[PDB]
Short mmCIF file of N, CA and C in Angstrom, two decimals:
data_model
loop_
_atom_site.label_atom_id
_atom_site.label_comp_id
_atom_site.label_asym_id
_atom_site.label_seq_id
_atom_site.Cartn_x
_atom_site.Cartn_y
_atom_site.Cartn_z
N UNK A 1 20.46 278.86 -42.94
CA UNK A 1 21.08 278.61 -41.65
C UNK A 1 21.92 279.49 -41.08
N UNK A 2 22.14 279.35 -39.86
CA UNK A 2 23.35 280.55 -39.57
C UNK A 2 24.90 279.93 -39.57
N UNK A 3 25.81 280.51 -39.83
CA UNK A 3 27.28 280.12 -39.98
C UNK A 3 27.70 279.57 -38.34
N UNK A 4 28.09 278.75 -38.33
CA UNK A 4 28.61 277.83 -36.67
C UNK A 4 29.43 277.46 -36.68
N UNK A 5 29.91 278.42 -35.10
CA UNK A 5 31.50 278.18 -34.93
C UNK A 5 31.30 276.78 -34.01
N UNK A 6 31.42 275.66 -34.28
CA UNK A 6 31.00 274.62 -32.96
C UNK A 6 32.20 274.45 -32.32
N UNK A 7 31.64 275.06 -30.97
CA UNK A 7 32.92 274.77 -29.85
C UNK A 7 32.99 273.38 -29.24
N UNK A 8 32.61 272.60 -29.93
CA UNK A 8 32.66 271.14 -29.82
C UNK A 8 34.13 270.28 -30.82
N UNK A 9 33.86 271.39 -32.24
CA UNK A 9 34.55 270.76 -33.07
C UNK A 9 36.06 271.74 -33.29
N UNK A 10 35.60 272.68 -32.41
CA UNK A 10 36.96 273.81 -32.40
C UNK A 10 37.71 272.75 -31.34
N UNK A 11 37.44 272.42 -29.93
CA UNK A 11 38.05 271.72 -29.06
C UNK A 11 38.96 270.38 -29.51
N UNK A 12 38.11 269.71 -30.36
CA UNK A 12 38.47 268.30 -30.29
C UNK A 12 37.93 268.00 -31.73
N UNK A 13 39.23 267.30 -32.10
CA UNK A 13 39.43 266.89 -33.70
C UNK A 13 38.14 265.71 -34.45
N UNK A 14 38.62 265.51 -35.78
CA UNK A 14 37.68 264.71 -35.82
C UNK A 14 37.76 262.85 -35.51
N UNK A 15 39.29 262.52 -35.12
CA UNK A 15 39.48 261.03 -34.49
C UNK A 15 39.20 261.09 -32.98
N UNK A 16 39.32 262.61 -32.33
CA UNK A 16 38.45 262.16 -31.00
C UNK A 16 37.17 262.25 -31.00
N UNK A 17 36.13 262.93 -32.19
CA UNK A 17 34.81 262.90 -32.07
C UNK A 17 34.23 261.78 -32.74
N UNK A 18 34.99 261.06 -33.45
CA UNK A 18 34.45 260.01 -34.09
C UNK A 18 34.77 258.53 -32.61
N UNK A 19 35.51 258.59 -31.85
CA UNK A 19 35.46 257.65 -30.95
C UNK A 19 34.87 258.03 -29.86
N UNK A 20 34.47 259.48 -29.78
CA UNK A 20 33.10 259.09 -28.56
C UNK A 20 31.96 259.24 -29.27
N UNK A 21 31.52 259.08 -30.28
CA UNK A 21 30.52 258.85 -31.46
C UNK A 21 30.68 257.88 -31.01
N UNK A 22 31.29 256.85 -31.31
CA UNK A 22 31.35 255.51 -31.63
C UNK A 22 30.63 254.94 -30.18
N UNK A 23 31.61 254.81 -28.78
CA UNK A 23 31.35 254.74 -28.05
C UNK A 23 30.04 254.94 -27.69
N UNK A 24 29.63 256.50 -27.41
CA UNK A 24 27.83 256.23 -27.14
C UNK A 24 27.10 255.81 -27.75
N UNK A 25 27.28 255.66 -28.86
CA UNK A 25 26.27 255.09 -30.21
C UNK A 25 25.89 253.47 -29.45
N UNK A 26 27.42 252.48 -29.36
CA UNK A 26 27.37 251.25 -29.01
C UNK A 26 26.51 251.07 -27.18
N UNK A 27 27.16 252.28 -26.63
CA UNK A 27 26.53 252.32 -25.25
C UNK A 27 25.05 252.92 -25.22
N UNK A 28 24.67 253.06 -26.16
CA UNK A 28 23.24 253.76 -25.85
C UNK A 28 22.63 253.49 -27.64
N UNK A 29 21.90 252.83 -27.99
CA UNK A 29 21.85 252.48 -29.12
C UNK A 29 20.45 253.23 -29.75
N UNK A 30 19.57 253.57 -28.57
CA UNK A 30 18.24 253.59 -29.09
C UNK A 30 18.41 255.42 -28.77
N UNK A 31 19.08 256.10 -28.14
CA UNK A 31 19.13 257.31 -28.10
C UNK A 31 19.98 258.02 -29.05
N UNK A 32 19.60 259.18 -29.32
CA UNK A 32 20.19 259.91 -30.42
C UNK A 32 21.17 261.13 -29.54
N UNK A 33 22.37 261.11 -30.17
CA UNK A 33 23.69 261.94 -29.59
C UNK A 33 23.51 263.28 -30.26
N UNK A 34 23.21 264.48 -29.75
CA UNK A 34 23.20 265.68 -30.05
C UNK A 34 23.97 266.45 -29.50
N UNK A 35 24.37 267.47 -30.20
CA UNK A 35 24.81 268.72 -30.21
C UNK A 35 24.45 270.05 -30.39
N UNK A 36 24.23 270.36 -29.50
CA UNK A 36 23.27 271.63 -29.74
C UNK A 36 24.37 272.58 -29.15
N UNK A 37 23.91 273.99 -30.28
CA UNK A 37 24.80 275.15 -29.81
C UNK A 37 24.03 276.70 -30.21
N UNK A 38 24.51 277.33 -29.98
CA UNK A 38 24.02 278.41 -29.90
C UNK A 38 24.24 279.24 -31.22
N UNK A 39 23.63 279.90 -32.17
CA UNK A 39 24.33 280.84 -33.42
C UNK A 39 25.01 282.23 -33.08
N UNK A 40 26.02 282.30 -33.37
CA UNK A 40 26.62 283.19 -32.69
C UNK A 40 26.14 284.54 -33.03
N UNK A 41 26.27 285.84 -32.41
CA UNK A 41 25.57 287.29 -32.35
C UNK A 41 23.46 286.47 -31.68
N UNK A 42 23.54 285.61 -31.35
CA UNK A 42 21.75 285.17 -30.58
C UNK A 42 21.80 285.97 -29.47
N UNK A 43 21.24 287.12 -29.11
CA UNK A 43 21.47 287.45 -28.04
C UNK A 43 20.61 286.48 -26.60
N UNK A 44 19.95 285.19 -27.06
CA UNK A 44 19.36 283.94 -26.34
C UNK A 44 20.47 283.57 -25.20
N UNK A 45 20.00 283.03 -23.72
CA UNK A 45 20.53 282.42 -23.20
C UNK A 45 21.41 280.96 -24.23
N UNK A 46 22.65 281.02 -23.34
CA UNK A 46 23.62 279.71 -23.62
C UNK A 46 23.00 278.92 -22.93
N UNK A 47 22.94 277.43 -23.86
CA UNK A 47 22.83 276.38 -22.83
C UNK A 47 23.95 276.04 -21.87
N UNK A 48 23.61 275.84 -21.01
CA UNK A 48 24.71 275.34 -19.94
C UNK A 48 25.20 274.05 -20.69
N UNK A 49 24.67 272.89 -21.13
CA UNK A 49 25.48 271.94 -21.70
C UNK A 49 24.66 271.70 -22.70
N UNK A 50 25.87 271.19 -23.85
CA UNK A 50 25.43 271.27 -25.28
C UNK A 50 25.42 269.53 -25.51
N UNK A 51 25.63 269.03 -24.80
CA UNK A 51 25.55 266.83 -25.47
C UNK A 51 24.51 266.73 -24.89
N UNK A 52 23.23 265.63 -25.30
CA UNK A 52 22.34 265.52 -25.16
C UNK A 52 22.12 264.06 -26.05
N UNK A 53 21.10 262.93 -25.38
CA UNK A 53 21.02 261.64 -25.40
C UNK A 53 19.87 261.74 -25.52
N UNK A 54 18.96 261.84 -26.92
CA UNK A 54 17.25 261.76 -26.85
C UNK A 54 16.86 260.85 -27.62
N UNK A 55 15.64 260.45 -26.67
CA UNK A 55 15.16 259.41 -27.25
C UNK A 55 14.91 259.32 -28.85
N UNK A 56 15.07 258.28 -29.54
CA UNK A 56 14.88 258.49 -31.11
C UNK A 56 13.65 258.96 -32.29
N UNK A 57 12.40 258.79 -30.93
CA UNK A 57 11.02 258.99 -31.42
C UNK A 57 10.45 260.21 -31.07
N UNK A 58 11.12 260.93 -30.16
CA UNK A 58 10.63 262.50 -29.91
C UNK A 58 10.83 263.28 -30.62
N UNK A 59 9.99 264.10 -31.16
CA UNK A 59 10.03 264.84 -32.66
C UNK A 59 10.58 266.19 -32.12
N UNK A 60 10.70 266.43 -33.12
CA UNK A 60 11.64 268.21 -33.01
C UNK A 60 10.35 268.99 -32.41
N UNK A 61 9.02 269.34 -32.61
CA UNK A 61 8.45 269.65 -31.85
C UNK A 61 8.41 269.59 -30.10
N UNK A 62 8.43 268.15 -29.78
CA UNK A 62 8.54 267.73 -28.70
C UNK A 62 10.14 268.58 -27.96
N UNK A 63 11.24 268.66 -29.07
CA UNK A 63 12.54 268.85 -28.37
C UNK A 63 12.58 270.42 -28.63
N UNK A 64 11.90 271.34 -29.47
CA UNK A 64 11.65 272.47 -29.21
C UNK A 64 11.26 273.11 -27.73
N UNK A 65 10.04 272.21 -27.74
CA UNK A 65 9.71 272.84 -25.86
C UNK A 65 10.30 272.33 -24.85
N UNK A 66 11.18 271.12 -24.87
CA UNK A 66 12.12 270.60 -23.98
C UNK A 66 13.82 271.72 -24.16
N UNK A 67 14.35 272.30 -25.00
CA UNK A 67 15.31 273.30 -24.85
C UNK A 67 14.78 274.69 -24.75
N UNK A 68 13.29 275.07 -25.15
CA UNK A 68 12.72 276.45 -24.52
C UNK A 68 12.69 276.55 -22.81
N UNK A 69 12.54 275.65 -22.24
CA UNK A 69 12.57 275.39 -21.12
C UNK A 69 13.97 275.59 -20.31
N UNK A 70 14.53 275.03 -21.17
CA UNK A 70 16.05 275.23 -20.66
C UNK A 70 17.31 276.45 -21.32
N UNK A 71 16.45 277.27 -22.00
CA UNK A 71 16.81 278.66 -22.27
C UNK A 71 15.95 279.79 -21.95
N UNK A 72 15.29 279.24 -20.80
CA UNK A 72 14.31 280.91 -19.67
C UNK A 72 13.77 281.29 -21.14
N UNK A 73 12.99 280.70 -22.05
CA UNK A 73 12.37 281.73 -22.92
C UNK A 73 10.96 281.96 -22.67
N UNK A 74 10.12 282.98 -23.23
CA UNK A 74 9.04 283.17 -23.43
C UNK A 74 8.38 282.58 -23.85
N UNK A 75 6.87 282.77 -24.10
CA UNK A 75 5.77 282.23 -25.12
C UNK A 75 6.35 283.37 -26.68
N UNK A 76 6.41 284.50 -25.92
CA UNK A 76 6.87 285.66 -26.92
C UNK A 76 8.11 285.83 -27.77
N UNK A 77 9.21 285.02 -27.07
CA UNK A 77 10.33 284.82 -28.05
C UNK A 77 10.89 283.96 -28.75
N UNK A 78 11.21 284.47 -29.53
CA UNK A 78 11.31 283.56 -31.06
C UNK A 78 12.61 282.42 -30.88
N UNK A 79 12.05 280.79 -31.20
CA UNK A 79 13.52 280.03 -31.21
C UNK A 79 12.94 279.01 -32.21
N UNK A 80 14.26 278.98 -32.94
CA UNK A 80 14.48 278.05 -34.19
C UNK A 80 15.30 277.18 -34.43
N UNK A 81 15.43 276.05 -34.73
CA UNK A 81 16.33 274.87 -34.80
C UNK A 81 17.07 274.87 -36.13
N UNK A 82 18.26 274.40 -36.36
CA UNK A 82 18.62 274.46 -37.64
C UNK A 82 19.53 272.96 -37.89
N UNK A 83 18.87 272.12 -38.39
CA UNK A 83 19.85 271.23 -39.15
C UNK A 83 20.24 270.48 -40.37
N UNK A 84 21.38 270.32 -40.15
CA UNK A 84 21.76 270.46 -41.69
C UNK A 84 21.88 272.07 -42.22
N UNK A 85 21.97 272.90 -41.42
CA UNK A 85 21.62 274.24 -42.21
C UNK A 85 20.19 274.50 -42.62
N UNK A 86 19.34 273.56 -42.18
CA UNK A 86 17.62 274.18 -42.55
C UNK A 86 16.84 274.05 -41.55
N UNK A 87 16.00 274.72 -41.43
CA UNK A 87 14.87 274.19 -40.31
C UNK A 87 13.92 273.13 -40.59
N UNK A 88 13.95 271.89 -39.52
CA UNK A 88 13.21 270.78 -40.04
C UNK A 88 11.97 271.12 -39.80
N UNK A 89 10.88 270.31 -40.06
CA UNK A 89 10.05 270.02 -39.82
C UNK A 89 9.27 269.63 -38.60
N UNK A 90 8.20 269.94 -37.69
CA UNK A 90 8.29 269.92 -36.62
C UNK A 90 7.44 268.45 -35.58
N UNK A 91 7.42 267.92 -37.06
CA UNK A 91 6.47 266.11 -36.49
C UNK A 91 7.82 265.58 -36.97
N UNK A 92 8.74 265.88 -37.64
CA UNK A 92 9.98 264.89 -37.96
C UNK A 92 10.51 264.19 -36.82
N UNK A 93 10.84 263.09 -36.71
CA UNK A 93 12.16 262.26 -35.40
C UNK A 93 13.04 262.84 -35.15
N UNK A 94 13.83 262.76 -34.07
CA UNK A 94 15.15 262.87 -33.89
C UNK A 94 16.01 261.59 -34.65
N UNK A 95 15.42 260.29 -34.67
CA UNK A 95 15.49 259.50 -34.92
C UNK A 95 15.85 259.93 -36.64
N UNK A 96 14.88 260.38 -37.16
CA UNK A 96 15.02 260.60 -38.49
C UNK A 96 15.81 261.67 -39.06
N UNK A 97 15.89 262.78 -38.22
CA UNK A 97 17.30 263.70 -38.42
C UNK A 97 18.87 263.39 -38.09
N UNK A 98 18.83 261.66 -37.36
CA UNK A 98 19.71 261.30 -37.23
C UNK A 98 20.14 260.56 -38.56
N UNK A 99 19.52 259.74 -39.16
CA UNK A 99 19.40 259.12 -40.33
C UNK A 99 20.11 259.50 -41.39
N UNK A 100 19.64 260.89 -41.56
CA UNK A 100 19.46 261.31 -42.46
C UNK A 100 20.97 262.68 -42.63
N UNK A 101 21.01 263.11 -41.11
CA UNK A 101 21.77 264.05 -40.97
C UNK A 101 22.66 263.94 -39.85
N UNK A 102 23.21 262.90 -39.33
CA UNK A 102 24.38 262.63 -38.85
C UNK A 102 25.36 262.96 -39.57
N UNK A 103 26.44 263.45 -39.01
CA UNK A 103 28.17 263.85 -39.34
C UNK A 103 28.75 262.54 -39.46
N UNK A 104 30.25 262.27 -40.13
CA UNK A 104 30.78 260.89 -39.57
C UNK A 104 31.37 260.90 -38.52
N UNK A 105 31.64 261.56 -37.56
CA UNK A 105 31.56 261.15 -36.10
C UNK A 105 30.17 260.55 -35.82
N UNK A 106 29.52 260.55 -36.02
CA UNK A 106 28.34 259.65 -35.25
C UNK A 106 27.56 260.49 -34.79
N UNK A 107 27.64 262.13 -34.61
CA UNK A 107 26.91 263.23 -34.00
C UNK A 107 25.91 263.56 -35.03
N UNK A 108 24.91 264.36 -34.39
CA UNK A 108 23.66 264.92 -34.90
C UNK A 108 24.07 266.92 -34.46
N UNK A 109 24.61 267.62 -35.00
CA UNK A 109 24.05 268.83 -34.64
C UNK A 109 22.90 269.69 -35.03
N UNK A 110 22.91 270.38 -34.05
CA UNK A 110 21.56 271.32 -34.13
C UNK A 110 21.93 272.73 -33.22
N UNK A 111 21.51 273.40 -34.46
CA UNK A 111 22.15 275.13 -34.12
C UNK A 111 20.59 275.61 -33.76
N UNK A 112 20.52 276.61 -32.50
CA UNK A 112 19.37 277.32 -32.11
C UNK A 112 20.22 278.74 -31.88
N UNK A 113 18.67 279.61 -32.82
CA UNK A 113 18.59 281.15 -32.88
C UNK A 113 17.18 281.42 -32.35
N UNK A 114 17.36 283.05 -32.40
CA UNK A 114 16.21 283.45 -31.90
C UNK A 114 15.94 284.56 -33.97
N UNK A 115 16.65 283.94 -34.45
CA UNK A 115 16.28 284.56 -36.05
C UNK A 115 16.06 283.52 -36.73
N UNK A 116 15.25 283.31 -37.99
CA UNK A 116 14.97 282.14 -38.45
C UNK A 116 15.72 282.39 -39.99
N UNK A 117 16.41 283.33 -40.43
CA UNK A 117 17.03 283.67 -41.61
C UNK A 117 18.39 283.99 -41.43
N UNK A 118 19.27 283.68 -42.42
CA UNK A 118 20.37 284.11 -42.42
C UNK A 118 21.14 284.29 -43.64
N UNK A 119 22.34 285.28 -43.98
CA UNK A 119 22.77 285.28 -45.45
C UNK A 119 23.75 284.06 -45.28
N UNK B 1 29.85 265.14 -19.78
CA UNK B 1 28.95 263.69 -19.57
C UNK B 1 27.29 264.16 -20.17
N UNK B 2 27.12 263.23 -20.92
CA UNK B 2 25.70 263.59 -21.55
C UNK B 2 24.25 263.88 -20.68
N UNK B 3 23.36 264.38 -21.21
CA UNK B 3 22.47 264.87 -20.32
C UNK B 3 21.26 264.24 -20.96
N UNK B 4 20.67 263.29 -20.60
CA UNK B 4 19.07 262.20 -20.45
C UNK B 4 18.04 263.37 -21.33
N UNK B 5 17.42 263.10 -21.81
CA UNK B 5 16.32 263.74 -22.06
C UNK B 5 15.03 262.96 -22.10
#
């Protein structure tokens, strides 16, 4: 996966992020709180919104299709997601990814890029 | 604020 500068983590320290994660997980327990950010140097559209609350049983594949619409991509342009710095399987649910890969602040972080392989 | 999908 790409080496990420997470703007959410640059702006907000762990204590602040954990408080927000705590709150949102109690308010919306069946939704996964996800922070989505673009890989540095990718020339894809930057998402206008980075914070999403996603149904737990939505698949990665279905999430690809929703994000694709929001970043104005064609069928010709490539889009790849990275969770825990690896590409998730398309049938995996957002709930399963959260269970396995949420950070200590209680968010799931997902990076996107037009490239699939990074040094 | 969070966006609901």
